[PDB]
A paper describes a structure:
The resulting proteins, Rtms5Y67F and Rtms5Y67F/H146S, have green fluorescence emission (, 508 nm), and are the first FPs reported that have both green emissions (500–525 nm) and a phenylalanine in the chromophore tripeptide. Each of the protomers in Rtms5Y67F and Rtms5Y67F/H146S consist of the same 11-stranded β-can motif typical of members of the GFP-superfamily of proteins. Located at the core of the barrel is the circularised tri-peptide QFG chromophore maintaining covalent links to Cys65 and Ser69 of the main-chain. The structures show evidence for the presence of an acylimine linkage extending the chromophore conjugation system that contributed to the green fluorescence emission.
Rtms5Y67F/H146 is also predicted to form a tetramer with222 non-crystallographic symmetry in the biological unit. The fluorescence excitation and emission spectra for Rtms5Y67F and Rtms5Y67F/H146S were similar (, 440 nm; , 508 nm), but compared to Rtms5Y67F (ΦF, 0.11) the fluorescence quantum yield for Rtms5Y67F/H146S (ΦF, 0.75) was somewhat higher. Compared to Rtms5Y67F, the structure of the Rtms5Y67F/H146S chromophore is less well defined with B-factors higher than the side-chains of the surrounding residues. A simulated annealing omit map shows that compared to Rtms5Y67F, the Rtms5Y67F/H146S chromophore is not well-defined in the electron density. Nevertheless, sufficient electron density exists to enable the modelling of a trans, non-coplanar Rtms5Y67F/H146S chromophore. As a result of the His146Ser substitution, a pocket exists in Rtms5Y67F/H146S with the potential to accommodate the chromophore in a cis conformation. In order to investigate the possibility that the Rtms5Y67F/H146S chromophore is mobile and is able to adopt alternate conformations, the trans and cis chromophore conformations were modelled at different occupancies. The analysis suggests that the trans conformation of the Rtms5Y67FH146S chromophore is favoured. The Oγ of Ser 69 and ηOH of Tyr 14 in Rtms5Y67F/H146S are within H-bonding distance of the acylimine oxygen. Our data for Rtms5Y67F/H146S show that contact between the benzylidine moiety of the chromophore and the side-chain of Arg197 prevents a coplanar conformation.
Numbering used by the authors:
A (entry chain A), B (entry chain A), C (entry chain A), D (entry chain A): 7 to 65, 69 to 225
Write the structure that this text describes.
Amino acid sequence: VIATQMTYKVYMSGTVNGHYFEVEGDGKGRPYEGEQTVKLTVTKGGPLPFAWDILSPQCSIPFTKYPEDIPDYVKQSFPEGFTWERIMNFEDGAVCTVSNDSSIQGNCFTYHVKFSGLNFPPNGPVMQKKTQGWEPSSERLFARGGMLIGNNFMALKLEGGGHYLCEFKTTYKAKKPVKMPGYHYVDRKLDVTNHNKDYTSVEQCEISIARKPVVA
Amino acid sequence: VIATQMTYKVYMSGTVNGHYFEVEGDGKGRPYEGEQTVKLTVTKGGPLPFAWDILSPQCSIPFTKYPEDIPDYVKQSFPEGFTWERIMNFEDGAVCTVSNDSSIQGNCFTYHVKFSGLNFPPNGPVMQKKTQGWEPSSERLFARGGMLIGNNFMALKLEGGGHYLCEFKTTYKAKKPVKMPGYHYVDRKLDVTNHNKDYTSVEQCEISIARKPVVA
Amino acid sequence: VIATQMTYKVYMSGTVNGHYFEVEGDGKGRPYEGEQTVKLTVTKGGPLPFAWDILSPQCSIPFTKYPEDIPDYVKQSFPEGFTWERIMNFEDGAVCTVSNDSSIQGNCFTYHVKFSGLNFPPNGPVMQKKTQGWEPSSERLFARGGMLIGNNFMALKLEGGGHYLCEFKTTYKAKKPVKMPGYHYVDRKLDVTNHNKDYTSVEQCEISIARKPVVA
Amino acid sequence: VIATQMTYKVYMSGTVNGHYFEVEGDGKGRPYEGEQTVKLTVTKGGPLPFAWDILSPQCSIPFTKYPEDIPDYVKQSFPEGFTWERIMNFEDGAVCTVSNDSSIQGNCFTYHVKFSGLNFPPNGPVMQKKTQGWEPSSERLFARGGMLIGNNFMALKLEGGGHYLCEFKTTYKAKKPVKMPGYHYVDRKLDVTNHNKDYTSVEQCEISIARKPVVA
Ligand SMILES: [Cl-]
Ligand SMILES: [Cl-]
Ligand SMILES: [Cl-]
Ligand SMILES: [Cl-]
Ligand SMILES: [Cl-]
Ligand SMILES: [Cl-]
Ligand SMILES: [Cl-]
Ligand SMILES: [Cl-]
Ligand SMILES: [Cl-]
Ligand SMILES: [Cl-]
Ligand SMILES: [Cl-]
Ligand SMILES: [Cl-]
């Protein structure tokens, strides 16, 4: 139902401090090897007056390597698909809510995402564009009410050193009953590998591998 | 610049658990007496599969009675106007982010609002439609960085008694420097005074009066 | 059971960033008029290396004026008494947990309080002693599981202007079933009216009056 | 300064919903291999009317295996030592604040800990004793202001399945400047390996290993 090589399209719209924007992306990768790559274009509201980094993790949870002994909640949701709902709380008080809807047509995945972010302070690092990508991260995942819940302590690298913290809570909602995983983790690295001067165009590479708890 | 009787139009769109909707409203009242009334129509995505109450407070901060001894931040923002950015955190984990943009053309105010709400649990009171309006509330307001910040502990009455708590944080952003108020409160009552069977149409009445701290 | 003039004793111990301290106080006032006054001494761990203001609201909920039409949960708890449990979350990340136990012997109230506060940053206003008393405040109060729950958005005035925000959540637990109040507010002003140079001795005056919602 | 085999003593006192308790413990292990074991006795306030599990993670951060390429902030703090300050936020609203002070005398470590926990609801799993140990966990660690900050999404297993979530924030404060680590993780498993009927006596085994991010 999901082939070992897949493509995908991303339509993302939203607001940041009330500034509207649209993004489109084309991506590809190996759903079973955990790798993927995507090229995004700001099609409306560019150049963005805020850091691109807040949008990069919104742009492919089907592309996560599960070992055969951990039920892969999101792959099983197919072909009906799944949604996800996400809250990001930044340490200087900014909050975003983001939702995704994922569908499949052949060997193309389609993600529709809505992004709403606000209370980024005018002198903070998102609005001054002082961020330099995300540390690699590790999401704690567990099953509840037939849903998959993910908690991630994320951090943006800052220009001139140190970190700007963001907590992620992501709820994954299959459109049909599936076989629920036990308690586990997903390790990710997200990199911007190319971009133009004003981030109206961007390319990213992500690796994500699920695993059992490392110790015991 | 603001007459003692004013009308207004509301265009509100957004998502709740990823369900898209549009609302339009026509309202009127006495900006200096703190009273106002509005009739709303769900123009898209109706009937809504969630409680209307989560949307009612999104639908007119110009209509707040200030005593002459408290600078009225929002009226002064006119005619350039103002925006506001709002986070609502519900005690069962749901969060919404909402932004408004307010403009003026003659004696009509126009509010454009975007609403993004999610992680309302499927058996909770918003999705089961068990709520029965908001308690009257009192918002703590103070000045910082040229902005007005409002904190409100809100509560929805529940069918069969008790309360469902929601915290509001609202940041009001004038589009030009204005004269900043000191520390103060705004008391509100919001009532649904008419509606049809499925809340595709709704009418509301609100009173809001600013005051100094009651004791000392 | 509670006379119209009452005295009280306060024994408070705790830690702030791990620094242990003990306070004792002697207080008096009119439980039915909402007024009271208390003199506190730092009996151990003085002079304190942090702002006294974080301790001032820990030092008499029996002394709150209720109108006859609002059940007074805390007075009814007597003579068995009551406890309260409190969480304070400061906007720069510091948190305290505080519990009180209140007993009565004749016309003396006795409050035993434990205070635990930490993650006050070393350059923040509590540890640099930059605070200048609390704004007057207004606590939203409601009944649940036979308990009284109070939510308060508090603010400390800062040296050189502006505010340092603290959210209070206080749960009041009668030691026997009592008649539960409806949804209401309590307005307070707390003032330090005298002190010595290093706040090893302090005197405070508080007024608190319960009321119904002001508007509607 | 720290030998490859070490012993330790724990004195812990505190309150839970205002119930006072004291614990003492004797422990031993291999500070460089990440292993350790400890036997605890409730010396005052036993039997405890709440789940022991809330106390088990308070009872040895010197015993963490660092690879040679990650500065070990806590070992370097010796012999002056270190403190830590911790906030635990449980998903049903309970909060604890905990502080530790660690000293060294020869080849014995001494931990003094204070524990303050409250708003555990009377029918929740801590007060009904429905918990069954902690999932293995993984703490995100980073340097800021000369301090080490740790964020952990923890979970208690429940009787009859599912999880009760607790977020940990722990700040580690060396008593002298040390060489600061980069961004890293510590994986732990904490097990109760023996206990008597009412948890007045308890034995625990913990493994903790620091590592770099797994992916990239
Ligand atoms: Cl802001
Ligand atoms: Cl499940
Ligand atoms: Cl990542
Ligand atoms: Cl949900
Ligand atoms: Cl200002
Ligand atoms: Cl209201
Ligand atoms: Cl700190
Ligand atoms: Cl009740
Ligand atoms: Cl106060
Ligand atoms: Cl409780
Ligand atoms: Cl540092
Ligand atoms: Cl653990």
